[PDB]
Every structure is written in structure tokens, then in C-alpha cells.
Ligand binder design. Structure first.
Ligand SMILES: *[C@@H]1O[C@H](CO)[C@@H](O[C@@H]2O[C@H](CO)[C@@H](O[C@@H]3O[C@H](CO[C@H]4O[C@H](CO)[C@@H](O)[C@H](O)[C@@H]4O)[C@@H](O)[C@H](O[C@H]4O[C@H](CO)[C@@H](O)[C@H](O)[C@@H]4O)[C@@H]3O)[C@H](O)[C@H]2NC(C)=O)[C@H](O)[C@H]1NC(C)=O
Ligand SMILES: *[C@@H]1O[C@H](CO)[C@@H](O[C@@H]2O[C@H](CO)[C@@H](O[C@@H]3O[C@H](CO[C@H]4O[C@H](CO)[C@@H](O)[C@H](O)[C@@H]4O)[C@@H](O)[C@H](O)[C@@H]3O)[C@H](O)[C@H]2NC(C)=O)[C@H](O)[C@H]1NC(C)=O
Ligand SMILES: *[C@@H]1O[C@H](CO)[C@@H](O[C@@H]2O[C@H](CO)[C@@H](O[C@@H]3O[C@H](CO)[C@@H](O)[C@H](O)[C@@H]3O)[C@H](O)[C@H]2NC(C)=O)[C@H](O)[C@H]1NC(C)=O
Lengths: 77, 48
């Protein structure tokens, strides 16, 4: 790996009061938008329910920030 | 001293390629997942 970029990150994101954690990747803040991607290659993906997980509330996670989570149910319904 | 200082923030590419900077806690959280304990456990028990 070589040429890189600076991004802002977050341990977790808070949505509906719940603490959402990433699966295999890390949360990344680009030019005014949050995505999720693998550490070894910057390829940003939309943050969706199925690509993250939730456990515990937004209570004890240090540095947790507010965000939204996409749920296919909405356009599917 | 240089090695230790480096690894403290440099992470996985430290001895492989270009230096990167990763927040300490983030690095640790990953290494825990690397063992087989769900990542969130570290944050919740970060103090302990
Ligand atoms: C992610 O997003 C969430 C949601 O916004 C943020 O959490 C909120 O943080 C705010 C600020 O601390 C909490 O504010 C609540 O305001 C209520 C309204 O009263 C205030 O505002 C009116 C406006 O006119 C004033 O007139 C009034 O004098 C007050 O200034 C309060 O009632 C809430 O009080 C709660 O806690 C006390 C604790 O003893 C209880 O007694 C109350 O009954 C009540 O429970 C509170 O102050 C807001 O509640 C928070 N929401 C949640 C869900 O936590 C996160 O901070 C944000 N994350 C980041 C990183 O910014
Ligand atoms: C941070 O993430 C943000 C959210 O994804 C990024 O915002 C996006 O920025 C791009 C700019 O490249 C906008 O693209 C728009 O695309 C439409 C469609 O036409 C274009 O694509 C067709 C495909 O074949 C191509 O043929 C055309 O020539 C165009 O290339 C254009 O009409 C718009 O003018 C614009 O190009 C995204 O829409 C925009 N997303 C949102 C939600 O606004 C942001 O850029 C990212 N920042 C960084 C630094 O990466
Ligand atoms: C990620 O951000 C860091 C800083 O938070 C970048 O490092 C800094 O980059 C600047 C510009 O490349 C370096 O030079 C500085 O230029 C300004 C211009 O006026 C000057 O005033 C400063 O005195 C300095 O010369 C700066 O030294 C550098 N700092 C460090 C510690 O590296 C970094 O390059 C960014 N990385 C990416 C991939 O964008």
C-alpha cells in the first residue's frame, strides 16, 4: 500500500440512541459524509444496518458521535 | 526508543510500508478482534 489520505474517524456511531459498531472495517469521515471501509484500501461504502452491528446504548462509548444508519426496509416497504 | 515510539501510533504498516497514524484505542480494539473477542468489548471495558 502507498499513497494515502487524511480522514476523521469514530469508534462508533449513535443512532436511535443505540451504539453501532463496524464489522470488518472502520468508520471514515470524508468531505462532509460518513462511510465505512477496509483499513488496507480506501473504498468508502454506505453505512447500512447489515454492514454494522449494534450492542449497548450510546452511554459508555468514548468518542461516540451522532449519525444515521441506512435500512433497506424503508425503500423496500 | 524509536521503534517503540513508532509502533505506539504507526500500526500494521510500520515495518512494511508508508507510515500511517491510527488512534491508540482504535488500534487496540482491532487487535482484540484479531483474537476472537468482539471489538465492542474493549471500548466498554476500556477503563478496566
Ligand atoms: C447526539 O444527539 C443526542 C440527541 O440530541 C445528544 O444528546 C442530547 O444532549 C442534550 C444536551 O446535553 C440533552 O439535552 C436535554 O435538553 C432537555 C431540554 O431542557 C433544556 O433546553 C431547554 C430549551 O428551551 C431549556 O429551556 C431548558 O432550561 C434546558 O436548557 C432537558 O430536559 C434534558 O434533561 C434530561 O436529563 C436530566 C438529567 O438530570 C433529566 O432530569 C431530565 O428529565 C432529562 O432527562 C436534557 O438536558 C439531550 O437529552 C440529549 N439527548 C440524549 C438522547 O441523550 C448527544 O449529546 C449527541 N452526541 C454528541 C457527541 O453531541
Ligand atoms: C464525500 O462523500 C460525498 C457523498 O458521496 C461526495 O459527494 C458526491 O460528490 C460527487 C462529485 O463527484 C457528486 O457527483 C455528482 O454526480 C452527478 C451525476 O453525473 C456524474 O456521473 C455521471 C456517471 O456516468 C457522469 O457521466 C457525469 O459526467 C458526472 O460525472 C453530477 O450531475 C453532479 O454534478 C455531481 O457530479 C455526488 O452526487 C456527491 N454526492 C452527494 C450525495 O452529493 C463528496 O464529493 C465526497 N468528498 C470527497 C472529498 O471525496
Ligand atoms: C494529514 O494532516 C497532517 C497535519 O495535521 C499533514 O501533515 C502536515 O502537512 C503540511 C502540508 O503538507 C506540512 O507542512 C506545513 O505547511 C504549512 C503551509 O503554510 C506550514 O505553515 C507549516 O509550517 C508546515 O510547513 C506539515 O509539516 C505536516 N505536518 C506533519 C506533522 O506532518 C499530513 O500531510 C496530512 N496527510 C495527508 C495524507 O493529507
Amino acid at each position: 500500500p502507498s499513497q494515502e489520505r487524511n480522514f476523521t474517524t469514530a469508534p462508533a456511531i449513535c443512532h436511535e440512541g443505540k451504539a453501532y459498531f463496524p464489522r470488518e472495517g472502520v468508520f471514515v469521515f470524508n468531505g462532509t459524509s460518513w462511510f465505512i471501509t477496509q483499513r488496507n484500501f480506501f473504498s468508502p461504502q454506505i453505512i447500512t444496518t447489515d454492514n454494522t452491528f449494534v450492542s449497548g446504548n450510546c452511554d459508555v462509548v468514548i468518542g461516540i458521535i451522532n449519525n444515521t444508519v441506512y435500512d433497506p426496509l424503508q425503500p423496500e416497504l | 526508543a524509536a521503534l517503540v515510539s513508532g509502533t505506539a501510533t504507526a500500526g500494521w504498516t510500520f515495518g512494511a510500508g508508508a507510515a500511517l497514524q491510527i488512534p491508540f484505542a482504535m488500534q487496540m480494539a482491532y487487535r482484540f478482534n484479531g483474537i476472537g473477542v468482539t471489538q465492542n468489548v474493549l471500548y466498554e471495558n476500556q477503563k478496566q
